[PDB]
Curated annotation (Swiss-Prot):
It comes from Humicola insolens. GO terms for biological process: cellulose catabolic process. Its EC number is 3.2.1.4. This is Endoglucanase 1. Monomer. GO terms for molecular function: cellulase activity. The active site is at S197 (nucleophile), E202 (proton donor).
Length: 398
């Protein structure tokens, strides 16, 4: 969509690049909301309304073709990101799901480089990524997410998408969802927006999940028909790693009886361990809290390989079939090596209560507990804060 007259004022966020010799050194980055979360309206004289809702192609009245859509649909800059529940303070990023006035912005943002016109491209195979988090205000059913998608570095800036990454264009993920614009272009045929996604963190105060999701296509792929479905180009389920799912119940939760006590802030370390020929072999998650390293649990479940890291043996044995079919850990690593964009978000699930995250095999939450209608009775204003985003040499971030 065509950028409007309103100014885009990106929150600044300091992050770090780390080595063993030099420690963690500060870097300036910026934060951008998803393009379609910006106000979208029509060109002068065309009346009120937007240019389509999530799940749909854009409307034919204004978007009969890409060229027309590009001139008839206007995307405004956001001059005050706090209106969308997005604020920064030095090295901290705060995402508010619900604002005091009752708006539910459910923000999703990306990390821009210091120029504001290209995403910061992270290349994590053979390196580690770490952050600090406050998960206290995330009850059952909430998903705070910090993850990587293989988006185009300028958001596919082009003739009909002059806005590009500066306006947060180009989002994709392993679910291949239909959005009315893809790569900043009207999605006239209602294709899905697919790409590899590495879910470093999907969590709340009750459960913590890690999952690589492979696709058999590089970068953003516009899928049609069955390509967008379960047996298609992308791994919807992912290879999930959650202590509960592997029969470890005392590792992560609200209180002193858990190794990682989510009533207090903590540090989250993720290492992407490569084999001698440079390909990804294992993903290793551990934590730090109150100045003490908390090593990963090992799996503790009959029929599950004994391991403290995600790898192909584990993913195969736990039934992560599309993960394996669409590239396995090497394939995930190949995407990581090419480079990926960092996305951070907070969201809930009206259809399914986020049960896969924290209910049943995945956590302590009861049936119905994670419904949005209940979430607000438990925590009226869910939020997350991510602090001191930092990446670099193995061993150097913590
Ligand atoms: O379901 C809608 C929400 O999707 C979130 O992104 C997911 C993505 O779809 C998955 O493939 C995987 O990568 O995890 C992501 C993080 O949970 C998105 O961040 C939200 O904004 C959407 O509401
Ligand atoms: O798009 C929603 C959500 O899906 C997650 O996968 C779930 C899936 O929704 C559920 O139907 C299936 O039975 O279990 C998987 C988990 O194994 C996915 O992992 C998330 O990233 C995604 O946000
Ligand atoms: C689950 O863990 C408990 C505690 O270690 C153990 O006694 C039990 O046998 C495990 N169950 C399975 C199915 O592995």
């Amino acid at each position: 969509q065509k950028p409007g007259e309103t100014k885009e004022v990106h929150p600044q966020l300091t992050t770090f690049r780390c080595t063993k010799r030099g420690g963690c050194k500060p870097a300036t980055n910026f934060i951008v909301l998803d393009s379609l979360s910006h106000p979208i309206h029509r060109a002068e004289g065309l009346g009120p309304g937007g240019c389509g809702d999530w799940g749909n192609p854009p409307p034919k009245d204004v978007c009969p073709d890409v060229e027309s859509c590009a001139k008839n649909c206007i995307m405004e800059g956001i001059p005050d990101y706090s209106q969308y529940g997005v604020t920064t303070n030095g090295t901290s990023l705060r995402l508010q799901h619900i604002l005091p006035d009752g708006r539910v912005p459910s923000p999703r943002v990306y990390l821009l480089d210091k120029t504001k016109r290209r995403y910061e491209m992270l290349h994590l195979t053979g390196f580690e990524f770490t952050f600090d988090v406050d998960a206290t205000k995330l009850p059952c059913g909430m998903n705070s997410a910090l993850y990587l998608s293989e988006m185009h570095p300028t958001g596919a800036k082009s003739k009909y998408n002059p806005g590009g990454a500066y306006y947060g264009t180009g989002y994709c993920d392993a679910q291949c969802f239909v959005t009315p614009f893809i790569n900043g272009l009207g999605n006239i045929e209602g294709k899905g927006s697919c790409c590899n996604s590495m879910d470093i963190w999907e969590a709340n105060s009750r459960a913590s999940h890690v999952a690589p999701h492979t696709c058999n296509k590089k970068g953003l792929y516009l899928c049609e028909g069955e390509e967008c479905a379960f047996e298609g180009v992308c791994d919807k389920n992912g290879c999930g790693w959650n202590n509960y799912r592997v029969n470890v119940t005392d590792y992560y939760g609200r209180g002193e009886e858990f190794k990682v006590n989510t009533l207090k802030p903590f540090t989250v370390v993720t290492q992407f361990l490569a084999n001698r020929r440079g390909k990804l072999e294992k993903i290793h998650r551990f934590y730090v809290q109150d100045g003490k390293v908390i090593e990963s649990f090992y799996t503790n479940k009959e029929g599950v390989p004994y391991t403290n890291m995600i790898d192909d043996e584990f993913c195969e044995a736990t039934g992560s079939r599309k993960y394996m079919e669409l590239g396995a850990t090497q394939g995930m690593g190949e995407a990581l090596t090419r480079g990926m964009v960092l996305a951070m978000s907070i969201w809930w699930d009206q259809g399914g209560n986020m049960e896969w995250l924290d209910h049943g095999e995945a956590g302590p939450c009861a049936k119905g507990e994670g419904a949005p209608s209940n979430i607000v009775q438990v925590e009226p204003f869910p939020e997350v804060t991510y602090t001191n985003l930092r990446w670099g040499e193995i061993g150097s971030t913590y």
